[PDB]
Amino acid sequence: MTDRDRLRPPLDERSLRDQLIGAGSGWRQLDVVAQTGSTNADLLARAASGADIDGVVLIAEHQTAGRGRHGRGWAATARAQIILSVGVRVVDVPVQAWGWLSLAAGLAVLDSVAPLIETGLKWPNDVLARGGKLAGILAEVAQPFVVLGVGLNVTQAPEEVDPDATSLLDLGVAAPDRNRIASRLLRELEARIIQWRNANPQLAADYRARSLTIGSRVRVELPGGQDVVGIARDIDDQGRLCLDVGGRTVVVSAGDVVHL
Numbered sequence: 001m002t003d004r005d006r007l008r009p010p011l012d013e014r015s016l017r018d019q020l021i022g023a024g025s026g027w028r029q030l031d032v033v034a035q036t037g038s039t040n041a042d043l044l045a046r047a048a049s050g051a052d053i054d055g056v057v058l059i060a061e062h063q064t065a066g067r068g069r070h071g072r073g074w075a076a077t078a079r080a081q082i083i084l085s086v087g088v089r090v091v092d093v094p095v096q097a098w099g100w101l102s103l104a105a106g107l108a109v110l111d112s113v114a115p116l117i118e119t120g121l122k123w124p125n126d127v128l129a130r131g132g133k134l135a136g137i138l139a140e141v142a143q144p145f146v147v148l149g150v151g152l153n154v155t156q157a158p159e160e161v162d163p164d165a166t167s168l169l170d171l172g173v174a175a176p177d178r179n180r181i182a183s184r185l186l187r188e189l190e191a192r193i194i195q196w197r198n199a200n201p202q203l204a205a206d207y208r209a210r211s212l213t214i215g216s217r218v219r220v221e222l223p224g225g226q227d228v229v230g231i232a233r234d235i236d237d238q239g240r241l242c243l244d245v246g247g248r249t250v251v252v253s254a255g256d257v258v259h260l
């Protein structure tokens, strides 16, 4: 751990803005802060006060009260992760389509690190590698916006955050460069968001091609603490998980997947 700190230099905010903001780029604003409770909470607070957060990026070197799905947490230590939130205007898109945005986010994350490295997307949005959770995605709503949060373990050690975690460094990526990764990440997200906004079928085909969950036997932990065990067959037009339970189709809009 003490050694991993020597592989955690800070992000160059100036250089990242030079790469990501400007003509042709959807990103309107990027800031790197030293510390916050939750980048999602922060962009949601901005929007609740009237700010236009469409194409706004907030990166945090450290995150002390990270949020997960379904009232869970997200652990981080300083400079170990890429922790960021982006604002996406969604009010132009019918509400039944908004869950795709979270699927698209996980695809963006997976694609931006895949070349550096059992690996793929667990439905809905989380990125697994060698069975460990490599990145967490969390989208929340602040009309007319969705705030899309990513926490990507770059040099983060499982013993620092969670027993089931993995990171680029634990997958053997030598000394991962968070500036390079964050630029690849935010360029991938931009295209994926544009794809979502325009109902591009390539989004669904690329998600299916990256899914670890489709085809596998799963147990799905439903909101409310009921479990269903079936075989995940597909996602539908709303990105809902289609389960085969001994012949019957069960379509799940929210849940925690365990692969069996």
Ligand SMILES: Nc1ncnc2c1ncn2[C@@H]1O[C@H](CNS(=O)(=O)NCCCCC[C@@H]2SC[C@@H]3NC(=O)N[C@@H]32)[C@@H](O)[C@H]1O
Pocket: 037, 038, 039, 040, 041, 063, 065, 066, 067, 068, 069, 070, 072, 073, 074, 075, 076, 083, 084, 085, 126, 133, 134, 136, 137, 138, 148, 149, 150, 151, 153, 156, 161, 162, 164, 165, 166
């Ligand atoms: N470091 C870490 N590595 C891997 N596993 C980790 C971890 N820490 C905790 N766990 C486990 O993962 C479970 C939660 N799983 S989840 O389904 O809720 N996934 C959704 C995750 C949300 C993404 C966070 C982003 S960061 C930018 C923005 N700002 C926020 O506040 N949120 C978003 C927990 O209970 C622990 O067991």
